[PDB]
Write a protein that binds this ligand. Structure first.
Ligand SMILES: CNc1cc(=O)n(C)nc1-c1ccccc1
Length: 108
């Protein structure tokens, strides 16, 4: 439905909000694969995903429903959990943002 997708746009807007910015910012745009320490990112992560790409996909009607949108949000988090050591600060930030997402996605 149009309504399901409108709710998805609302979840993504909250993920971009000032309230969550302290932990959401690494997910706003594609990972900078030219940064020092990120030389192997593309060899490990086959399908990079970020919040701006998801926003563009919603705008271009690339999701048929909420499950397709949710799969891209979860892909973004799973890339973070796969690539980094489990004790990395970015993994803790991904979990805080995933808490926001899962609670809204469950209640939509
Ligand atoms: C190890 N660095 C990262 C791992 C990761 O999973 N995400 C999402 N971002 C980063 C990152 C953050 C700032 C600058 C460059 C990369």
């Amino acid at each position: 439905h149009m309504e399901q997708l409108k709710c998805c746009s609302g979840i993504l807007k909250e993920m971009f909000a000032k309230k969550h910015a302290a932990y959401a910012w690494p997910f706003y745009k594609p990972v900078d694969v030219e940064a020092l320490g990120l030389h192997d990112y593309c060899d490990i992560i086959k399908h990079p995903m970020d919040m701006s790409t998801i926003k563009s996909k919603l705008e271009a009607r690339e999701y048929r429903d909420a499950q397709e949108f949710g799969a891209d949000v979860r892909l973004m988090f799973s890339n973070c959990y796969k690539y980094n050591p489990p004790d990395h600060e970015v993994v803790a930030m991904a979990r805080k943002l995933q808490d926001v997402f899962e609670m809204r996605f469950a209640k939509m």
